[PDB]
Amino acid sequence: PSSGSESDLVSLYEVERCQQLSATILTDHQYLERTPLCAILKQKAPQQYRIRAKLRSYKPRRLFQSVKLHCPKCHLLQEVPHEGDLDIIFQDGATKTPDVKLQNTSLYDSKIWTTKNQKGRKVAVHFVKNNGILPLSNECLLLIEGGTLSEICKLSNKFNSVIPVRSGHEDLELLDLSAPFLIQGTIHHYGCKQCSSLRSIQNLNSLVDKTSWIPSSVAEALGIVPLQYVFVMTFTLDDGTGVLEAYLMDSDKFFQIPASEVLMDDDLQKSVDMIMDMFCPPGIKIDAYPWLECFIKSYNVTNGTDNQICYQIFDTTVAEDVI
């Protein structure tokens, strides 16, 4: 293809003679000397390098797939549950029967309802108490069985934080660790089923206080290992001297956007869309893409028995005014 060979030639990459400014600044190791990509390829891993490049392409293109859950205890990635999955969980609680001995206790008291028209759904609410007294709403930890995902969300917006539970014959228990062990307004906290060894609501007595309800604290009390939120992306870096694919994994640093909240707040989603189509504007040629300084590490995966050299970005952030 003649026009193919021409457009191919104009899509080439000029070797860092340019007048443009950098889009990204590395927070640390600035002292390091620039290492051209080819020089890296010719060296065996692992090693640290400081590079300058352009994103010839990145994945995933549909950014709503980029967010992943992460367990630090066993370093396992996990997909985010869909709303349909949560519904498939909560649906099993709508038909359950509240138990008299789980209603009022030294630790929590309750109120009941039957929601009409909704196939006779049963719902029960329990309020946890501080030193045996109901705290103010801003500190009121609330528990639910039978509420839907939308209802528990809207309620979490109002109360401090809320825990989905079901009628355990001894004491209330999280209806499924697949569901959020804690939802705190726009934040859903999940746990690793492998590493967890969950405990009932009475074990809140292990907490240092009954007011802060720090997510980590209540997760530990309920015997749950909480999952982190992370972005995971693939940058196809190009520097004319060579082509190198490096992974990005970070929480609330590279984009300076909380990966925990991005899924539920629309402005953050607009922001990340804008950032990634500002590194890689639609359609126009790689001549006009901006330069991207970043710091990367290299390491051997060896999953294929040996080698499988990979690169991961570290300690770099988009420049303030570029956002």
């Binding site: 309020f127 209802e151 990979c310």
Partner: protein, 67 residues
């Protein structure tokens, strides 16, 4: 009991007003990415093995040893 019942009734009011006491369910608001995921449900979703993403703690060790 006025203060106590007022507090507990505040909590109960929040709950019951939030709870769908009667009638059918309702659709909550949806953000751009959530709606796009709902629309694209069925596409082969992107994911990466954590092994490739620096499970090599030996490499981490000798890396962090570097100056």
């Amino acid at each position: 009991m006025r203060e106590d019942q007022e507090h507990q009734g505040a909590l109960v009011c929040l709950a019951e007003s939030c709870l769908t006491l009667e009638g059918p369910c309702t659709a909550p608001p949806v953000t751009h990415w959530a709606a796009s995921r709902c629309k694209a449900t069925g596409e082969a979703v992107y994911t990466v093995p954590s092994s490739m993403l620096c499970i090599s703690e030996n490499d981490q060790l000798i890396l962090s040893s570097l100056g």
